[PDB]
Amino acid sequence: AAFRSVFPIQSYSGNSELQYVSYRLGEPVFDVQECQIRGVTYSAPLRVKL
Amino acid sequence: RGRVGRSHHQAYAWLLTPHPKAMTTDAQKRLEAIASLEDLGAGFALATHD
Amino acid sequence: GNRRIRSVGEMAENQFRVGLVRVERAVKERLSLGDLDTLMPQDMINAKPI
């Protein structure tokens, strides 16, 4: 709903347009317990094909 | 701008600008300076505003 | 019946939305900026605002 509510994007010269296809969450770089040990985020990277 | 002239014929100068939101702020003031100021002896005033 | 629960999902989606608002402004100015032929969908967007 967010990507559809923002995208697709005209340029100001009505010449180029950037649209959306799909997203996919990357694998988190560490485990949860490891992220508590090191002191950094258990975060999943987001990769979107545009 | 002083490159042409030196003859008995009306010369013309054609200045391509992008979309007004697309051009940068310094480029804006550059173009408004040279649009506002177009007559003889301008460059000293142009340097003065530079 | 007049007060509504906004749980974890809706605020996260809204903050993702307002983060994507700065991204779309950046790609507005960059995508409307020309020389678009050699441009890939990597350098218009920036992951810093998201």
Swiss-Prot record, chain A:
Domain of life (superkingdom): Bacteria
Subunit-structure text: The RNAP catalytic core consists of 2 alpha, 1 beta, 1 beta' and 1 omega subunit. When a sigma factor is associated with the core the holoenzyme is formed, which can initiate transcription.
Name recorded for this polypeptide: DNA-directed RNA polymerase subunit beta
Its biological purpose: DNA-dependent RNA polymerase catalyzes the transcription of DNA into RNA using the four ribonucleoside triphosphates as substrates.
Family recorded in the similarity comment: Belongs to the RNA polymerase beta chain family.
